[PDB]
Write a protein that binds this ligand. Sequence first.
Ligand SMILES: [Mg+2]
Ligand SMILES: [Mg+2]
Ligand SMILES: [Mg+2]
Ligand SMILES: [Mg+2]
Ligand SMILES: [Mg+2]
Ligand SMILES: [Mg+2]
Ligand SMILES: [Mg+2]
Ligand SMILES: [Mg+2]
Ligand SMILES: [Mg+2]
Ligand SMILES: [Mg+2]
Ligand SMILES: [Mg+2]
Ligand SMILES: [Mg+2]
Ligand SMILES: [Mg+2]
Ligand SMILES: [Mg+2]
Ligand SMILES: [Mg+2]
Ligand SMILES: [Mg+2]
Ligand SMILES: [Mg+2]
Ligand SMILES: [Mg+2]
Ligand SMILES: [Mg+2]
Ligand SMILES: [Mg+2]
Ligand SMILES: [Mg+2]
Ligand SMILES: [Mg+2]
Ligand SMILES: [Mg+2]
Ligand SMILES: [Mg+2]
Ligand SMILES: [Mg+2]
Ligand SMILES: [Mg+2]
Ligand SMILES: [Mg+2]
Ligand SMILES: [Mg+2]
Ligand SMILES: [Mg+2]
Ligand SMILES: [Mg+2]
Lengths: 69, 79, 228, 151, 131, 330, 59, 32, 59
Amino acid sequence: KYQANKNSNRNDIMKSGANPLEFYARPRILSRYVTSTGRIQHRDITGLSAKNQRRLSKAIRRCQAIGLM
Amino acid sequence: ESQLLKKIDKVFNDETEEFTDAYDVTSGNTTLQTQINNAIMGSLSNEKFFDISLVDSYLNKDLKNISNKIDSKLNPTSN
Amino acid sequence: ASTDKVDPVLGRADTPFITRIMAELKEPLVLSKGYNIEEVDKFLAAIESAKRERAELSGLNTEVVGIEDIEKLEDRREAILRILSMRNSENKNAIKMAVELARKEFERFPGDTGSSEVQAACMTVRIQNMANHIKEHRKDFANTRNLRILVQQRQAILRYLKRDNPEKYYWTIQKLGLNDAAITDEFNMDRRYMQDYEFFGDKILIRDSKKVANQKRKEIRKQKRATF
Amino acid sequence: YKPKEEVVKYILHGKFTKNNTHLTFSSVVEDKNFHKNKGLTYNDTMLYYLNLPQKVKISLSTGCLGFRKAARGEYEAAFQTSGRMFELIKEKNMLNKDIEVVMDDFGKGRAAFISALVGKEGASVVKKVVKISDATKLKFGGVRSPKMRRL
Amino acid sequence: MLYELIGLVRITNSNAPKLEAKELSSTIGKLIIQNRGVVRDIVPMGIRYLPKIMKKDQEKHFRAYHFLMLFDSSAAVQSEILRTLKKDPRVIRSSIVKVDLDKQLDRASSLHRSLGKKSILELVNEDYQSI
Amino acid sequence: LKIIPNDTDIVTLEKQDELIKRRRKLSKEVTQMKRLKPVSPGLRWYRSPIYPYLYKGRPVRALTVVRKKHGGRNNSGKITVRHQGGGHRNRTRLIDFNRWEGGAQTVQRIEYDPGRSSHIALLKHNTTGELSYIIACDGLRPGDVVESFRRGIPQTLLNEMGGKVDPAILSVKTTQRGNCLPISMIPIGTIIHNVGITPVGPGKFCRSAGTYARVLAKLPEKKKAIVRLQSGEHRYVSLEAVATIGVVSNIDHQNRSLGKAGRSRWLGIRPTVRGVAMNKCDHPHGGGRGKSKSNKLSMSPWGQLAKGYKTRRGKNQNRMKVKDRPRGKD
Amino acid sequence: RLNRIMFENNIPGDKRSQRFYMKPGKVAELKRSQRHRKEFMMGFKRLIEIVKDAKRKGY
Amino acid sequence: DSVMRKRKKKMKKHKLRKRRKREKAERRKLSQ
Amino acid sequence: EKTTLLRDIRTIQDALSSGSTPKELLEIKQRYGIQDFSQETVRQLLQLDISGLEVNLEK
RNA sequence: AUAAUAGUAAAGAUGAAAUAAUAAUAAUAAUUAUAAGACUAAUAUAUGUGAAAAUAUUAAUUAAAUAUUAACUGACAUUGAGGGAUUAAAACUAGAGUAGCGAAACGGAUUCGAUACCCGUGUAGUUCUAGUAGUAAACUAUGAAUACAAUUAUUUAUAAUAUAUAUAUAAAUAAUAAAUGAAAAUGAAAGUAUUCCACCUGAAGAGUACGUUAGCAAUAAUGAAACUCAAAACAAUAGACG
Ligand SMILES: [Mg+2]
Ligand SMILES: [Mg+2]
Ligand SMILES: [Mg+2]
Ligand SMILES: [Mg+2]
Ligand SMILES: [Mg+2]
Ligand SMILES: [Mg+2]
Ligand SMILES: [Mg+2]
Ligand SMILES: [Mg+2]
Ligand SMILES: [Mg+2]
Ligand SMILES: [Mg+2]
Ligand SMILES: [Mg+2]
Ligand SMILES: [Mg+2]
Ligand SMILES: [Mg+2]
Ligand SMILES: [Mg+2]
Ligand SMILES: [Mg+2]
Ligand SMILES: [Mg+2]
Ligand SMILES: [Mg+2]
Ligand SMILES: [Mg+2]
Ligand SMILES: [Mg+2]
Ligand SMILES: [Mg+2]
Ligand SMILES: [Mg+2]
Ligand SMILES: [Mg+2]
Ligand SMILES: [Mg+2]
Ligand SMILES: [Mg+2]
Ligand SMILES: [Mg+2]
Ligand SMILES: [Mg+2]
Ligand SMILES: [Mg+2]
Ligand SMILES: [Mg+2]
Ligand SMILES: [Mg+2]
Ligand SMILES: [Mg+2]
């Protein structure tokens, strides 16, 4: 019932403090915040702040535009 | 163009390493050591990347003043 | 008709002060972020001297790698200069430098940034910039509104200056290129103005079918015939 | 060097619409003198190996089993046509190579298709499937769809 | 203005896959330097296949060599560089992103700054002292 | 007292970017209609596009010939084409449809040619200086540089290796308006004009004002190409046939409005008399008391149906024809 | 596993929605209503958890 | 106002529009 | 001009150290009105203005 | 929508059915490949931003934007009649464009009828570029500014006790005490006050009629009186109905 994934809390780069937009050329890192099909998880799932989520989605969508992801 | 061609040859040399972004590193102490050395030892810094204090000492004669002071105690005064 | 017409937005054409500031912003070797060429060059020379004699004195036992090519050091210098060159930066920096110059040329004493004349000079620089922008983005209605507001604010401060210190008021408005009417009449940047002063050099508004204007024009231009 | 064609895989594709269902069966085929030919380039040849051609062998809809008008799209009709498809695979004896399965839409026939596949009906065919996936079509914007229905 | 360019270059004549990246980088670097500009750094990313079979000018593509140039120049030059890249058949895709400079004059490429190293000075000091 | 910042220091390409923006503005620019005050009833519906960049002087005499007026009459002296007659004295201009020579040529001016509907462009070769006339495309203005590659890519680039085929700068050197190339080296989908039929023949199709065609397909094995013409017809053409990039100038020529019969008379158009107004011995529609069409199917004076009757029919049809024109679809 | 993938990617509901067109205003109102209902359900879950805990501890 | 009160005016405008549609020729003749 | 401050300082330093004292030394002597050459002369020539503000702030 | 292939007699639309689709390469299902003209999945809450209309596919150039202290100016401010600018759909005049959707129009069906709800073919529109016009349930049905009034929760930025996430400010959103109110409710206002600017004096006639101004045109602004009546409305209660 209380199975909480705190390993993700410890090991997540985004919640560390780094700027999500700084990773726009890292499809490997960004792929850990998208579904199998490529959709972006909601904030309730990702756990990121509002600012971090907006920057992360912004970076992801950009990566898609450039074609690296 | 000389720098351009030299750096291009070095980078696209096969023997040179190439970052694939497939692995990850295990985890700044050297940078902190440089900064703290420049923070405390000031104009006496021997590090490659000195700070503005060295130029300030030059324009103030502080370095030359101290150098002649110590040298005058050493060779003339035999101390 | 025989009086003088001054644009409330741009003022008299070819104002010496405005053209001089624009020329200053477009000189051979100008840098951004407040780096003057003489200071940067002599600072780099000081850096080289610093390293030279520091290595020589601390390393009386010769441990120095060697002397570096003067051409290589000049390459470093040109690198810095290309980084900091003004014409390689934004126009934000240009407006900032122009505002600095205007402040120093209108301040009553070193450090006066709140005097009405200095305020007016800074808003004049900003108005020039936004007018240049609108002239290429004529549909930018938000920025047109901002420009209108800024021009009206300049009018407000200049009216206060007229009410407080008339001498400085006249001095400043004449130096800028604005006349007392352009400072003391209603203004809206309407299509009427924007066509009369040819903001884009094109027609913007149409007249009603009533031809009374041409009627009076010709009835007063009948001088060639037997009228007066 | 002369052209020759041999089948490498097979693909079974099902589109389950709201009014009807379609099952198609195809063979992924490959030539082995194509690479023997000289002068080719690695990019071209391997692009071909990612885009092998396919030929349709069996193709049947629900109408071949006597279902007409409203009966075309329904659970039992899909079950029957799927069973007939599997009997066709068995009888034309193309079960030796590997099989793949793909499904395109979410009509009433979706459940029936795989119920037949994993039931006693498709017991023989299921033994050769290794990849199961869906390839439904969606719009990231796209063209406007018809208006609301005011039923 | 500092600009970060990410570029994908076609791979042909597999004998020298990096030859085309080399040539294109040389050309754009010459453009930048002759246009009163300075390339900050060029770093390759390696041979990597594309997420999808990507098509340009009726030519299929599956893999492309990736490279990243951080260079300082003006808006006009930036534009022309972008238009030349878009024109060039040697490039499949490319993008330029402005690297802000109001806070710091020295900014490392997005890749190192993602690693956590925020300055070319940091990189060079690490190379000199650690290695 | 004089003060001006003369330190332009424009970077090598910044001039190119500046002129690119200027080209964009001049392409955005539009053309207006001349409308005179209707002090007379004949001026009320007289509209004509005005191009302020056109050249007001005379043409080069060495490139013109006097245009002989026939009046619609053939070598027997009888009217064979009606409604054609007196008009303003004119000279025909020897304009080039082949563009064999090659090399770079600068457009000196753009002129009105009364013998056609499109404007014409005077050219001067950069190396030899010979003058020539060609059809001006839409964006052509005095000052531009054009070239023809009908002979082929030049040795100047082949030996220099800079613009040779290996880096494939030829694509961007080709798909630019004004120049002339074979369909073989024109890419698919390009809007072209002055299309030929044969590898050695002049440009024949898509030659009037505002007209263009599109390259739809290439067939190297059959040495052929499929082009869609302004009629909407897909047609086979020789793959090594001529074609120029860009639409033909004077797009607005169709919005012009002659305001009076005298203007048609000047242009050389005599009145047209309807068949119904005639007598039965004349046009079949003739006869009948009052206005009457006589229950006669609309037809020419010589008994040929004038509504939908395909005139080119039977064995003698177009051998080079993939698809017919819309024919009422539009 | 296929069923779970499509359910979690909301492929079926998306396909049902895209069949017909809806006005942007109606789309917005539907989005707001659905978000409110989900928010309310989460809050109700929390309150019920509090009730269960209080019962377990004797309140 | 309430939807009822709005309908009472909606009918007004509908009748006005029918009016202006049916008096088209007369209005044209009067206005030349 | 055909020369720069960095190379000029290099030339004067080389003259001070080795003692060559060529025609270029005289040229730069009139270029900066420096009748004599020494480390003090170099430092004085390259003096910065920031020191003045520092001292004034201290005062 | 085009062509290639291979494969067959159906498919595709309906609550259920029929018109415009289909075996003569021969249709839907399938894989390639060549095109176009709209829109922009998830993130996402319109959170935030903008004066409002509006705004969430990628870069760029330009144009302003938030908080602290530093200095400066020195009441330069609020409101704002007349005016001015912007103003969603739908409209209209010119170019291009027209895939999908779709007023009208013609046919299917359903009906006692069905000038409709359902289905087919689809014009004008919807798109871009120039412009004209200035209204919508243009709504928070709530004009702006200033000084104040009792409490809880969350998120936001910045400020440190100091071992470190425990501490301080303000901002927004939710629920309330007072207060107000016809009540529903509002709750930093629809409370306590102060200065302005736009409106209201019963329905109905009527935003109609006649001038007038403006627009290419639709149409917009301004806007009246006869003859009638004791009517006409809002909140909240019980119910009876679905
Ligand atoms: Mg003001
Ligand atoms: Mg059904
Ligand atoms: Mg339809
Ligand atoms: Mg005729
Ligand atoms: Mg004629
Ligand atoms: Mg006629
Ligand atoms: Mg006639
Ligand atoms: Mg007669
Ligand atoms: Mg006869
Ligand atoms: Mg008759
Ligand atoms: Mg009311
Ligand atoms: Mg199909
Ligand atoms: Mg989205
Ligand atoms: Mg909000
Ligand atoms: Mg006032
Ligand atoms: Mg007003
Ligand atoms: Mg809308
Ligand atoms: Mg139109
Ligand atoms: Mg319909
Ligand atoms: Mg308007
Ligand atoms: Mg109205
Ligand atoms: Mg209203
Ligand atoms: Mg609302
Ligand atoms: Mg307000
Ligand atoms: Mg205000
Ligand atoms: Mg109360
Ligand atoms: Mg009250
Ligand atoms: Mg009240
Ligand atoms: Mg009205
Ligand atoms: Mg009520």
